[PDB]
Design a protein around this nucleic acid. Sequence first.
RNA 1: GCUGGUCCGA
RNA 2: UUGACUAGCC
RNA 3: UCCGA
Length: 529
Amino acid sequence: MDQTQPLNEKQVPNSEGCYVWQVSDMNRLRRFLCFGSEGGTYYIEEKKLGQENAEALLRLIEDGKGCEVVQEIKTFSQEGRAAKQEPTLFALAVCSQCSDIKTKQAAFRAVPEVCRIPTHLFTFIQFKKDLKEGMKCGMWGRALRKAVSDWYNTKDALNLAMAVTKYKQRNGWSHKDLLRLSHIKPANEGLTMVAKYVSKGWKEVQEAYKEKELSPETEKVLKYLEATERVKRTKDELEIIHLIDEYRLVREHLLTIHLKSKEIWKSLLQDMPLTALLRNLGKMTADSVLAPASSEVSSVCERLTNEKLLKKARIHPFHILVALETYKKGHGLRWIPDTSIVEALDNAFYKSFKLVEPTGKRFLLAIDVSASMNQRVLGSILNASVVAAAMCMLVARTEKDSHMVAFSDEMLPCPITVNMLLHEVVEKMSDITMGSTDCALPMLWAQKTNTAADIFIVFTDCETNVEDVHPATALKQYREKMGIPAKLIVCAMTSNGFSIADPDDRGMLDICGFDSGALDVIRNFTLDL
RNA sequence: GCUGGUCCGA
RNA sequence: UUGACUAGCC
RNA sequence: UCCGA
Ligand SMILES: [Mg+2]
């Protein structure tokens, strides 16, 4: 009895034809939320992968778990546990469409909390448009009109003014489009002004409010909207700098000619929101606004390493990782990556995760480096082995008693250590992918060598394909031969529906890579909590 | 007063 | 933007 | 496709 044979009737064949278990639908939902389906996997094509997860979603709704789905989507969104928004928004769109009335109602109820910025709302609505044929249903019923109307009417006019000028339109939709389709009725004078600005433009608003009496709050909105117009009618460096300071305008408010100015950037740097700062490190370095040993460089490092703000702004470790890698590249533009910035990014990476108190148990961390793990993740340049290595570094730095190992169809030494800097672990890992997949190795190896481990964490895509015993079986053998209640945590690295964890074994757990809140689930499972 | 749906955006 | 239609609710 | 702590 080996992997090419089913262990029981509950097992199904994976992409290689070997037998594993079907991961639960709620668990597959989480994998989807964290990895999406873009780029598909080594075995499944993008489109097919998308349909598979969409199928699982519909199955959840059909099984009457639609409200649990929405709750899970909302939780991931609010806590920022997922690197990208597309998957959560696509899922919310499905739930808001054709689902049972309860599911649909919970979904729209979650719109304000899930769609925080215009880009989210625009993307959500576009997916509902794409789902319009496949789900045989229209989208502009009273519920969507109401949800969109509330999105605008429950917001402070001045804040909305910032939102509609910074994000005029994204992913196919503009605010004008939404107002036209929602037929919103402004809830106050500030909203009416903004609605008028979005629908007819500045000139219209100006003529509409001339000789008109306005509260002091409305006056603020008018002045702000005017500033966004004024900044586009001048090439004077100082006037722009003063408007930025005065109205806290951001990069999105400026013209191309303005972004060539080192001084405009320095003033832009003053109150640059966190994500924008992270993504423009390369640009500002090339322009010398982030000069070596400068005062800006030092300021930037302090912002990137402040755990409180990283959480507040919902900065995800994967964003940190991607930024780190491209910044280190030194080209995108050409620049000398600042070593202090590079060190701060490494530091922020770990801080971006939801940290927890250590358990003090013995962990054996095994990274799957088989050929399939060369698959790209989240449309980035980083493969699954690289991403999993980053997760291992996280766990290894949380649990002092951690041992890292690698494997394909044979055990291999791990070329990374707990003291390395992230960019270094990345370089040491993108040449390792090779060979077949034997997911039972870690447990078999530990037994053979008498290595004591309380927890086995295996980072893989669960596409095991060697004529060796089932990993579940290897785990059972380890428990008996070593006299240790070892547990296996399967850290999924894709959104396929396969798992080597035995559903009937309370000692085996399914979770997925780069869920910024995964360290919490691991701690609870480990401590039997 | 309210909430489901069809149409109306680009 | 500040709907049309339709189905229904208090 | 740039989440104002
Ligand atoms: Mg493989």
